[PDB]
Amino acid sequence: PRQVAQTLQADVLWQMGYTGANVRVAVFDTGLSEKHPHFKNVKERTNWTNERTLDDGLGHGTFVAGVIASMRECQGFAPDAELHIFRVFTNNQVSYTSWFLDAFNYAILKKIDVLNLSIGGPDFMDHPFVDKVWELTANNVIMVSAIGNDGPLYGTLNNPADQMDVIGVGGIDFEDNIARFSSRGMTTWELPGGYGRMKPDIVTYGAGVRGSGVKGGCRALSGTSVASPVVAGAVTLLVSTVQKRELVNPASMKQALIASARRLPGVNMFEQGHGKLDLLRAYQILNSYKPQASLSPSYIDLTECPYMWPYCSQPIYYGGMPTVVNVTILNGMGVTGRIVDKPDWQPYLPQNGDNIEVAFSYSSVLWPWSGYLAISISVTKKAASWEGIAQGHVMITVASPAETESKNGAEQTSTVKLPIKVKIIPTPPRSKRVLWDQYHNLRYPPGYFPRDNLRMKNDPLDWNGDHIHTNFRDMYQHLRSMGYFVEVLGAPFTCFDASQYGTLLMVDSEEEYFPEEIAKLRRDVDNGLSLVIFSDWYNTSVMRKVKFYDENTRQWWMPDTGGANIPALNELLSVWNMGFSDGLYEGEFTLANHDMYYASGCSIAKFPEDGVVITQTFKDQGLEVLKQETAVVENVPILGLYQIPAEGGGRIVLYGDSNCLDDSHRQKDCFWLLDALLQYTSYGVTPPSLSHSGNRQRPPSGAGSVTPERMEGNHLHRYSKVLEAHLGDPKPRPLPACPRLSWA
Amino acid sequence: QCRNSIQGKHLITDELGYVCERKDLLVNGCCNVNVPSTKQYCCDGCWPNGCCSAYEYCVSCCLQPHFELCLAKCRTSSQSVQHENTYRDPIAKYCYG
Ligand SMILES: *[C@@H]1O[C@H](CO)[C@@H](O[C@@H]2O[C@H](CO)[C@@H](O[C@@H]3O[C@H](CO)[C@@H](O)[C@H](O)[C@@H]3O)[C@H](O)[C@H]2NC(C)=O)[C@H](O)[C@H]1NC(C)=O
Numbered sequence: 001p002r003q004v005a006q007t008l009q010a011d012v013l014w015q016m017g018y019t020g021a022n023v024r025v026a027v028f029d030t031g032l033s034e035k036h037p038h039f040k041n042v043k044e045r046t047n048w049t050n051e052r053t054l055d056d057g058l059g060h061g062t063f064v065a066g067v068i069a070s071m072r073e074c075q076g077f078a079p080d081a082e083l084h085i086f087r088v089f090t091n092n093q094v095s096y097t098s099w100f101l102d103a104f105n106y107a108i109l110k111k112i113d114v115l116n117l118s119i120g121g122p123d124f125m126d127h128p129f130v131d132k133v134w135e136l137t138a139n140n141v142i143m144v145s146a147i148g149n150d151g152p153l154y155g156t157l158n159n160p161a162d163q164m165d166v167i168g169v170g171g172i173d174f175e176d177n178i179a180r181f182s183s184r185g186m187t188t189w190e191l192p193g194g195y196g197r198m199k200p201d202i203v204t205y206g207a208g209v210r211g212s213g214v215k216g217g218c219r220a221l222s223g224t225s226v227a228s229p230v231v232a233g234a235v236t237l238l239v240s241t242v243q244k245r246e247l248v249n250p251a252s253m254k255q256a257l258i259a260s261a262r263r264l265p266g267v268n269m270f271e272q273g274h275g276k277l278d279l280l281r282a283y284q285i286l287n288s289y290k291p292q293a294s295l296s297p298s299y300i301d302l303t304e305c306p307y308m309w310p311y312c313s314q315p316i317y318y319g320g321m322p323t324v325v326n327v328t329i330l331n332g333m334g335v336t337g338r339i340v341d342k343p344d345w346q347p348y349l350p351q352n353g354d355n356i357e358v359a360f361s362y363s364s365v366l367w368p369w370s371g372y373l374a375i376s377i378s379v380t381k382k383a384a385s386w387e388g389i390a391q392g393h394v395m396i397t398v399a400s401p402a403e404t405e406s407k408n409g410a411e412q413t414s415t416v417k418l419p420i421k422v423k424i425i426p427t428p429p430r431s432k433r434v435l436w437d438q439y440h441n442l443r444y445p446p447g448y449f450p451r452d453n454l455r456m457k458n459d460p461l462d463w464n465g466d467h468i469h470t471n472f473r474d475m476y477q478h479l480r481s482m483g484y485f486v487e488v489l490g491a492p493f494t495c496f497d498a499s500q501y502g503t504l505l506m507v508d509s510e511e512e513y514f515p516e517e518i519a520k521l522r523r524d525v526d527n528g529l530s531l532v533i534f535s536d537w538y539n540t541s542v543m544r545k546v547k548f549y550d551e552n553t554r555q556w557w558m559p560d561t562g563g564a565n566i567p568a569l570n571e572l573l574s575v576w577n578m579g580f581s582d583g584l585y586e587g588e589f590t591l592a593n594h595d596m597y598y599a600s601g602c603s604i605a606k607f608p609e610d611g612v613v614i615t616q617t618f619k620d621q622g623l624e625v626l627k628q629e630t631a632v633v634e635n636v637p638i639l640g641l642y643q644i645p646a647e648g649g650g651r652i653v654l655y656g657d658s659n660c661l662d663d664s665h666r667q668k669d670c671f672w673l674l675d676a677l678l679q680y681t682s683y684g685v686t687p688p689s690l691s692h693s694g695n696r697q698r699p700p701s702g703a704g705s706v707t708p709e710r711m712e713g714n715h716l717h718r719y720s721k722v723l724e725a726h727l728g729d730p731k732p733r734p735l736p737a738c739p740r741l742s743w744a
Numbered sequence: 745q746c747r748n749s750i751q752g753k754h755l756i757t758d759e760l761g762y763v764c765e766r767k768d769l770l771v772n773g774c775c776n777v778n779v780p781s782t783k784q785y786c787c788d789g790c791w792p793n794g795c796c797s798a799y800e801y802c803v804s805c806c807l808q809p810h811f812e813l814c815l816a817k818c819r820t821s822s823q824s825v826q827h828e829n830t831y832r833d834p835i836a837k838y839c840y841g
Pocket residue numbers: 189190193194195196197324326361363372374
């Protein structure tokens with residue numbers, strides 16, 4: 001049978017005399033048995049759960065520990081490791097932050113070296129937890145955690161594996177293909193304004209690895225929570241190999257793995273990070289290591305891929321939105337670091353470097369052992385009609401306090417290059433350019449925002465970020481295949497030039513709208529800009545039913561808003577006499593010989609008469625949720641086209657469901673419809689499919705329809721970027737200034 | 745060789761009872777008393793309820809005329825959070841009283 005330890009050639013390190021001696025490893029899992037036959041040097045077992053037992057009822061803490069330090073049957077990486085078992089999970093894998101906070105302090109008290117956290121949570125706004133991890137990593141604890149098991153959807157990462165100072169581990173299979181369950185994508189703390197860092201850090205085997213059983217023997221399990229302890233074993237084994245233990249800190253340990261990984265062919269860096277773990281090569285890097293700063297990723301190449309996706313999906317051109325790469329800094333010289341001066345952009349004039357301007361933002365102090373360097377790339381005017389490659393490098397300098405051996409007391413220093421390579425093309429025509437609205441998205445963790453498809457009981461939150469690179473990745477790829485250049489809007493509507501973009505695409509928006517934004521948007525549309533609005537469900541009655549008890553905080557949670565903030569869109573859409581209803585609809589249907597599925601979307605309450613409205617029959621999902629009764633509604637207006645009467649005006653397309661372009665649980669894809677609607681908005685061509693259809697009906701006039709209203713006492717203002725926290729009848733803040741960059 | 749609060753982002757507290765910026769910390773683990781940035785038993789940022797806004801100020805005030813006890817006590821614990829995911833008093837999260 002398989003042996004994961006031997007597959008990574010850990011026995012080659014065993015023959016050299018390294019077996020994990022004196023390494024204090026803490027396993028935060030469901031506990032361990034009292035006299036398990038597979039383990040030596042289990043120095044302590046403690047219980048931080050409300051259950052009164054230290055034994056492993058589920059056997060997950062036993063499997064995890066055995067993968068790290070088992071000596072019998074299915075062997076472990078570090079047999080001689082000094083195991084510390086802290087039971088923080090119940091037999092059904094429930095946990096609370098207060099348990100973690102108390103346990104984390106004890107790990108600091110016991111001066112642990114390697115800590116493994118196999119089970120993570122989507123929440124990263126839990127400041128008490130996030131601060132403790134920083135305090136823990138500041139005390140020289142190497143933390144390893146799984147990125148999650150919610151793949152192949154993007155934007156499905158878990159905390160604290162998504163922190164800069166933690167090693168986030170993914171899962172591959174024994175054929176080196178990425179495991180379907182492994183979480184993927186960029187982090188989403190930085191949205192909408194910024195961009196997410198690259199995760200996972202590295203991947204390892206997480207499919208059918210064999211580990212210890214509760215009483216004995218060995219058994220198979222799959223997951224990234226299986227892949228995480230494989231790295232914790234390798235990390236524990238590597239820490240024992242180092243002759244000079246002082247060199248080992250969270251930054252240096254992570255640098256070793258990063259630089260020794262092997263790149264999976266045909267996979268991008270937001271699925272595999274730097275590649276698959278290589279235990280032997282990592283040992284060599286530590287054997288010849290010197291305290292230094294490094295960057296993850298080590299270089300920028302928006303041209304050669306699939307490794308560098310999405311940056312290779314479309315080139316840059318003059319007038320396009322800035323390209324941002326949030327690069328992580330790991331400082332192995334100290335817990336506290338500093339960036340000596342402004343980073344230096346050095347274009348290669350022989351290779352058209354001057355056609356690029358690069359801007360920088362960075363951390364005031366690098367702490368703990370890490371920080372960030374966000375680089376913004378834009379094309380200058382001279383290249384507006386040029387096609388080719390632009391190249392150069394960036395230099396940064398990191399400084400940290402004097403090392404102990406240095407009696408001089410001088411600051412440590414490290415200098416790092418960052419090559420940059422970009423493909424520039426002439427600015428495309430407006431008709432081919434699509435702007436993507438990200439600013440008006442609201443998401444969990446910060447607050448409770450309900451799911452989009454109410455049949456998906458298993459996932460009650462909207463937490464994937466709603467990004468063209470996370471859960472709209474398949475929509476994004478199809479548009480590129482059709483020739484459309486999609487760009488993201490991370491700032492209010494008052495911060496983009498409408499004349500550059502032919503279509504503005506708002507999909508499933510939750511945020512309120514500034515009055516200044518509405519006025520600005522109206523003028524832009526009157527000047528030839530197009531609006532495409534894909535919405536989702538909203539109902540004050542259904543929201544009060546979707547209420548559920550949040551066990552992790554011990555408190556009832558009410559929906560801050562519905563699928564989409566219909567009242568906010570209506571305040572925007574009033575300037576053209578358009579609006580949405582608060583109905584619920586689901587069901588299958590056909591348009592132009594294409595099967596379609598309506599997930600939970602709303603309907604068009606009001607529309608101008610001159611427009612084209614196609615209507616369909618659906619089941620009333622609102623009645624089911626409220627009263628579990630069944631009904632069918634004929635002639636529901638779900639799609640509406642319109643052309644602004646003013647000469648050279650824009651177009652407004654309305655569609656009531658956001659789920660046919662979302663990857664979360666897609667049943668059928670409506671990309672054929674998006675293509676037809678972009679053809680109409682980008683060229684005014686009304687397709688025969690949506691004009692000769694027998695589903696056409698007179699546009700609704702809105703007579704007698706009750707307008708959707710904001711829920712009474714809803715706490716959306718606590719998390720909105722637009723609204724002041726007035727605790728009642730919230731009002732928009734002053735319009736914030738548009739972001740600006742200091743180009744080098 | 746003084747023991748020190750290893751984790752401080754900006755400040756460090758030594759077992760003698762001083763608070764000093766990282767730049768003024770000696771390679772022996774002690775705060776440089778000869779520099780004015782070093783303050784003795786500085787309870788700045790601390791309220792009458794025994795709670796402080798910075799870990800190092802808490803540790804220093806705990807040693808007012810015991811180091812491991814002060815180091816452990818000043819840390820945020822389960823008693824510093826409400827509903828598991830929010831601090832009771834974010835401005836004064838560290839308490840020695
Ligand atoms: C790249 O990602 C990093 C984290 O992955 C982002 O760093 C964060 O940047 C924000 C500002 O954008 C920092 O907020 C700070 O808060 C207080 C406000 O009083 C103040 O100290 C600063 O003025 C600043 O606004 C935040 O601390 C920082 N987080 C960390 C962990 O360092 C960064 O924004 C991302 N960059 C881009 C371009 O997306």
